[PDB]
Structure formats: structure tokens, C-alpha cells
């Protein structure tokens, strides 16, 4: 098979300026009609992928000037001038010459910023869930920058490991911030045995009292 | 294949 | 106008069969390859096959040709594609696509498949209630993925955060925050579980 790798695998960009990814094909990609069948995706959060680049330098219709696309025999290239917080996601490239079809293995665009110390909510249990017998609780640490952050739980002061799992936002197109929720799930019987439940963002914190 | 008529 | 509209996400058991769907409009279908896309964690984008309705002729990916079978019915505009023998590998969503010398310029919305012998579980929805107001919406208890969250029915869609979802004992939970300016102007969660076919809407009360 044609296998296509791709170069870099992520690729942070700073908005305004200008960014490129490279494919290499382990052979050659011209069909015997003389075409090269060479394709850049995009594959933007929750969206399809779209099509950027066909027959290696050719924008789809809609697709802005700042995408090119160049190549030949086994290295091709898209070039983004004029980075916009839109263009991130996963671009691949595809080669629709020699069958079986294949996909490069992916690059993921994703815009540096200046650092956002993040919004931080907190949720007890809800009634509805209490009188089924479980017990969330929730803390959303939304449009922050960058990525990495830690989020700590206590609960009368003592930090708490168990029963949390996070879950991070892919970056938002509109300000390049990231998002996270933790839950601490506990049995309503172990909720109820406790008053003080915190979340710390880092320090950010917010808490309350029930149980 | 099909991309022969292209 | 020229859309590909996929059957919806579907759970099917281990060594069974599935079929999947892609209903073409807004072009002469004959005229356009569909072609198949599997999307996996982890694994990128793979090429299944296409099939080319004028002729009849599908081409399968050496690697799924022995679980694949591609058809088209042009009489109705649908590619459809069949999976056999499945198990928990063949988890994963699956595109269609059209091309014609042009690349694949238009895309089905894609369909979640899963393999499991778990039955499906409609999400139990709880209200996340408290300038700027953050509420939202814990989406616990459901299976398989996925599930859509929107708010006021779409007409909300500004200041959204639908976080993706966790397994644990086998179950599914997400979250959905929504931040508004603090008259008669409600909030209400809608969430989608196609899988199981349901809908629950939940107004968010101080
Ligand atoms: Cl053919
Ligand atoms: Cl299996
Ligand atoms: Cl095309």
C-alpha cells in the first residue's frame, strides 16, 4: 500500500502567521491517466471532514486564498498564510491514485495564545439524582489557556482522588481557549456523610455546603 | 478504473 | 441542494451484521462514487472501498473485504454498506462521501457504530442549576454513544461547552455548560440520544 506520512504531528501556530505541513508518499501517486489524486482534509471539532485541496495545488470552492497547496513525486505540501483561530483541527492528507486509498496519519493545527486563567463553577447533586440514590458533583473550569491545568478536589478540607474523572474540550474556534469538566461521583450514602465539597483550578476555587 | 475517464 | 444523509448511530452485537446507510440528494446519483471512511480513536482516517452506481462496481480496502460488502440502489439514491462478523474492532464512526475527479466534496454527517452485546440505555438528564451565569446539564447514565446537546432548541447556541463523554461500569456520562446575561427568557437543555431513539428536554430552575 501507499503509505503517507505526514510532518509535523502538531502544529501550534500563533495567529497571523504563516504555517506548513508536508506529506510524504512512499511512492508515487500518478495515476496512468497522468493525474496526481493528491487531497487535503480538514477535520474541524464535531464536523465532518472537508475538503481543502484537490490534484495536489487545486482549492475547492470556498476554501480562502491563504490555503495552498504544491508538489510532486513523493513530498507535497500545504501552506496556511495568515493563521485564523478557524483553521484549527486535524489535516490530512489523501492520495485517491492507487488503491487501496489511504490517509496520512494526521497533523493537529492548534493556535497559541496568550495564558486565561479559567471560569470556574461548581454544582452539588441535584435533587432529581439524590432521590435516585447518586451523587455528581460538578465543576466546570471553562476558556482557559493554556491546555494543561490541575484540578483538585476536597472535601472537609482532605483531598479526594477517588471518584473524579475530567474531561477536556477540544480548543475553541472563536477565542482559542480550552475547557474542562471534573465530577466527583460518590454513592449518596458517602455524600451525605460529608458538608464541605471544593474544587480548586490551578489558585482558583470554588465550594460549597450540603451533604 | 473509474479515473481512467477523467 | 447536494447533501449525503447517513442512517443514525446504531448498536449491533458481536458477530452479527449491520447495514448501514447514505441516501444522496440534490444530484444525479448515478454520476458521483460513494465512498466509505472509517474514523476510530487513535487510528486516524481509513479508506473502506467506494462504489461506482453508473457501473455497478465496488472496490474494497484488501484489509476489509472480507466484512464489506458495498451496494448502491439507484432507484432510490442510497449506497449502503454492510458490515459482517463484527466485533468490538469494527466500533467506530464510519463516513460516506462522494467524488467524481474532484475529491470527496461532500460528507454524510457520519453514524457511531457499536459493537457490544450491552443493551441500550436512554440518558437520565439532571439540571445543573446555580454578570454572567453559568448552568448546565449532566447527561448520565446512557449507552452507546452518542449524544446531542443543544440549547433552546438551537435557537441558543453562543457560550456552549459540551464536554465529551466518560465510560464507567459500562455507562456513559457527559456534561453541557451554557453561559447567558443575567424577563421571560428561559433556558432549557434539549438532548438527543439516537441510539435509543429518545429526546429529553430539561428547564433549568434557580
Ligand atoms: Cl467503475
Ligand atoms: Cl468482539
Ligand atoms: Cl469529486
Known amino acids: 500500500d501507499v503509505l503517507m506520512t505526514q510532518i509535523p504531528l502538531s502544529l501550534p501556530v500563533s495567529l497571523g502567521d504563516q504555517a506548513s505541513i508536508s506529506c510524504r508518499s512512499s511512492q508515487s501517486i500518478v495515476h496512468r491517466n497522468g493525474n496526481t489524486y493528491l487531497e487535503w482534509y480538514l477535520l474541524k471539532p464535531g464536523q465532518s471532514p472537508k475538503l481543502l485541496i484537490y490534484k495536489v495545488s487545486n482549492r475547492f470552492s470556498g476554501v480562502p486564498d491563504r490555503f495552498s497547496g504544491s508538489g510532486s513525486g513523493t513530498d507535497f505540501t500545504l501552506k496556511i498564510s495568515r493563521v485564523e483561530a478557524e483553521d484549527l483541527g486535524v489535516y490530512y492528507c489523501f492520495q485517491g491514485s492507487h488503491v487501496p486509498y489511504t490517509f496520512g496519519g494526521g497533523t493537529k493545527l492548534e493556535i497559541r495564545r496568550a495564558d486565561a486563567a479559567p471560569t470556574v463553577s461548581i454544582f452539588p447533586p441535584s435533587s432529581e439524582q439524590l432521590t435516585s440514590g447518586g451523587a455528581s458533583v460538578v465543576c466546570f473550569l471553562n476558556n482557559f489557556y493554556p491546555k494543561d491545568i490541575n484540578v483538585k478536589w476536597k472535601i472537609d478540607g482532605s483531598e479526594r482522588q477517588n471518584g473524579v474523572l475530567n474531561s477536556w474540550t477540544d480548543q475553541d474556534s472563536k477565542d482559542s481557549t480550552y475547557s474542562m469538566s471534573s465530577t466527583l461521583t460518590l454513592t449518596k450514602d458517602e455524600y451525605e456523610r460529608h458538608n464541605s465539597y471544593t474544587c480548586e483550578a490551578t489558585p482558583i476555587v470554588k465550594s460549597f455546603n450540603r451533604n | 478504473d473509474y479515473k481512467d475517464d477523467d | 441542494q447536494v447533501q449525503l444523509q447517513q442512517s443514525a448511530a446504531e448498536l449491533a452485537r458481536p458477530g452479527a451484521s449491520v447495514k448501514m446507510s447514505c441516501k444522496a440528494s440534490g444530484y444525479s446519483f448515478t454520476t458521483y462514487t460513494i465512498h466509505w471512511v472509517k474514523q476510530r480513536p487513535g487510528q486516524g482516517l481509513e479508506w473502506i472501498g467506494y462504489?461506482?452506481?453508473?457501473?455497478?462496481?465496488?472496490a474494497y480496502n484488501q484489509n476489509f473485504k472480507d466484512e464489506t460488502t458495498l451496494t448502491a440502489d439507484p432507484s432510490s439514491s442510497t449506497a449502503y454498506m454492510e458490515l459482517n462478523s463484527l466485533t468490538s474492532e469494527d466500533s467506530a464512526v464510519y463516513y460516506c462521501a462522494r467524488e467524481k475527479f474532484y475529491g470527496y466534496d461532500y460528507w454524510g454527517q457520519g453514524a457511531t457504530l457499536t459493537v457490544s452485546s450491552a443493551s441500550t440505555t436512554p440518558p437520565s438528564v439532571y439540571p445543573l442549576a446555580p454578570s454572567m451565569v453559568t448552568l448546565g446539564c449532566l447527561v448520565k447514565g446512557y449507552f452507546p454513544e452518542p449524544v446531542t446537546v443543544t440549547w433552546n432548541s438551537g435557537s441558543l447556541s453562543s457560550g456552549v461547552h459540551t464536554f465529551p463523554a466518560v465510560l464507567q461500569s459500562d455507562l456513559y456520562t457527559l456534561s453541557s455548560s451554557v453561559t447567558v446575561p443575567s424577563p421571560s427568557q428561559t433556558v432549557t437543555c434539549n438532548v438527543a440520544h439516537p441510539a435509543s431513539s429518545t429526546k429529553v428536554d430539561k428547564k433549568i430552575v434557580p
Open positions: 462504489i461506482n452506481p453508473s457501473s455497478g462496481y465496488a
